[PDB]
């Protein structure tokens, strides 16, 4: 397996990367420098985790050790919802940039399709609870994306959370400067994403799985809910290979021709999490665990299900 995969503008992105939602301000400086020192390349990032000045911090001191070159990291951040407007799009931008201590991204991913009045709060709320939206349209806000690509703010675009409708609607957008990288969207053998995933890499679209691990930290977790590290099926797929569930969880990913950005910030984890370039799961192994399948959707916001853009109406 190599380590990269070349996306359609042309440069090469590191399929395993660091996630960094919940990773505490406290801990993520400590978590990034570690992942570094242990071989990731790839650090994925988002200015709504409230981290990015931490995660900043930790890439500027490598690159100032000379652990690493710039151009042999791929860093990634999201504009989020409340910046879909034209005119706050390169601000946005700019935010993130200043906090990473960055002078470009590697990749800037609209991070919903939903956009947001604009303002302080991150979810602004009408009395009731529901999201209040904003009424600039994914294409426009696409438009703003390509504009950060021709002032050298970014390397590549793409999208995360859209459906296969939403990715159609930019790959049909008149006048469409630059297609979408990327599309990173959950997945992991309860929600494996199977059609969803045969459209984007039909397009040429890399994706991205995000919580593979089932994101047992989400906030809102019950004691009840299902959990992919302790599924005994998993384990035993694990077990037979001699590595721990949450290495074939990454591998899963990887041999579907994905990227994967497992998060923690327990150094080991870190470090154990990166040791999936020197096994194989067999086709057996892989059919198996897509088999796990349950259409269980860990992250979306009920605050939004009736905004016009709200991505997990359709099947996929
Ligand atoms: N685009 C989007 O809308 C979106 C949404 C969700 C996630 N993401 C991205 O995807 C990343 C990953 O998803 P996620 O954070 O939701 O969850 P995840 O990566 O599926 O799971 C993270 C959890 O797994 C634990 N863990 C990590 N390695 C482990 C291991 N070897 N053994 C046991 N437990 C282990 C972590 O614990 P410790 O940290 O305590 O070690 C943490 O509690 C995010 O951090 C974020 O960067 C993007
Ligand atoms: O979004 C991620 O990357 C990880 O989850 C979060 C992280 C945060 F720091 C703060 C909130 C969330 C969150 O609630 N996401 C879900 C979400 C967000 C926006 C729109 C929709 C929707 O359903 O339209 C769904
Ligand atoms: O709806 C949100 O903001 C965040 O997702 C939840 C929150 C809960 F309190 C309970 C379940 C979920 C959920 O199943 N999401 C998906």
Same mark, same amino acid.
């Given at each position: 397996? %190599?380590? &990269?995969?070349?996306?359609?503008?042309?440069?090469?992105?590191?399929?395993?990367?660091?996630?960094?939602?919940?990773?505490?301000?406290?801990?993520?400086?400590?978590?990034?420098?570690?992942?570094?020192?242990?071989?990731? &390349?790839?650090?994925?990032?988002a200015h709504?985790?409230?981290?990015?000045?931490?995660?900043?911090?930790?890439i500027?001191?490598?690159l &100032?050790?000379?652990?690493?070159?710039?151009?042999?990291?791929?860093?990634?951040?999201?504009?989020?919802?409340?910046?879909?407007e034209?005119?706050?799009?390169?601000?946005?931008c700019?935010?993130?940039?200043?906090?990473?201590?960055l002078?470009?991204?590697? =990749?800037?991913?609209?991070?919903?399709?939903?956009?947001?009045?604009?303002?302080?709060?991150?979810?602004?709320?009408?009395?009731?609870?529901?999201v209040?939206?904003?009424?600039?349209?994914?294409?426009?806000?696409?438009?703003?994306?390509?504009?950060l690509?021709?002032?050298?703010?970014?390397?590549?675009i793409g999208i995360?959370?859209?459906?296969?409708?939403?990715?159609?609607?930019?790959?049909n957008?008149?006048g469409?400067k630059?297609?979408?990288?990327?599309?990173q969207?959950?997945?992991?053998?309860?929600?494996?994403?199977?059609?969803?995933?045969?459209?984007?890499?039909?397009?040429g679209?890399?994706?991205?799985?995000?919580?593979?691990?089932?994101?047992?930290?989400?906030?809102?977790?019950?004691?009840?809910?299902?959990?992919?590290?302790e599924?005994?099926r998993?384990? %035993?797929?694990?077990?037979?290979?001699?590595?721990?569930?949450?290495?074939?969880?990454?591998?899963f990913?990887?041999?579907?021709?994905?990227?994967?950005?497992?998060?923690?910030?327990?150094?080991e984890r870190?470090?154990?999490?990166?040791?999936?370039?020197?096994?194989? =799961?067999?086709?057996?192994?892989?059919?198996?665990?897509?088999?796990?399948?349950?259409?269980? &959707?860990?992250?979306?916001?009920?605050?939004?299900?009736?905004?016009?853009?709200?991505?997990?109406?359709?099947?996929?």
């Amino acid at each position: 397996m %190599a380590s &990269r995969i070349l996306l359609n503008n042309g440069a090469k992105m590191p399929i395993l990367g660091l996630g960094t939602w919940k990773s505490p301000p406290g801990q993520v400086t400590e978590a990034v420098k570690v992942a570094i020192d242990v071989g990731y &390349r790839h650090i994925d990032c988002a200015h709504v985790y409230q981290n990015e000045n931490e995660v900043g911090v930790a890439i500027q001191e490598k690159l &100032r050790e000379q652990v690493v070159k710039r151009e042999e990291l791929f860093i990634v951040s999201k504009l989020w919802c409340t910046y879909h407007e034209k005119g706050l799009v390169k601000g946005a931008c700019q935010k993130t940039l200043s906090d990473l201590k960055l002078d470009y991204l590697d =990749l800037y991913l609209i991070h919903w399709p939903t956009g947001f009045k604009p303002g302080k709060e991150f979810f602004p709320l009408d009395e009731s609870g529901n999201v209040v939206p904003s009424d600039t349209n994914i294409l426009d806000t696409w438009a703003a994306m390509e504009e950060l690509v021709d002032e050298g703010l970014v390397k590549a675009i793409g999208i995360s959370n859209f459906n296969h409708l939403q990715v159609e609607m930019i790959l049909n957008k008149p006048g469409l400067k630059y297609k979408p990288a990327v599309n990173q969207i959950e997945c992991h053998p309860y929600l494996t994403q199977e059609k969803l995933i045969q459209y984007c890499q039909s397009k040429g679209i890399v994706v991205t799985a995000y919580s593979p691990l089932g994101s047992p930290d989400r906030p809102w977790a019950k004691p009840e809910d299902p959990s992919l590290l302790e599924d005994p099926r998993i384990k %035993a797929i694990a077990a037979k290979h001699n590595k721990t569930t949450a290495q074939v969880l990454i591998r899963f990913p990887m041999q579907r021709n994905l990227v994967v950005i497992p998060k923690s910030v327990t150094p080991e984890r870190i470090a154990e999490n990166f040791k999936v370039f020197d096994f194989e =799961l067999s086709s057996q192994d892989m059919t198996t665990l897509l088999s796990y399948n349950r259409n269980w &959707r860990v992250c979306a916001a009920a605050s939004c299900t009736s905004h016009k853009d709200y991505p997990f109406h359709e099947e996929f």
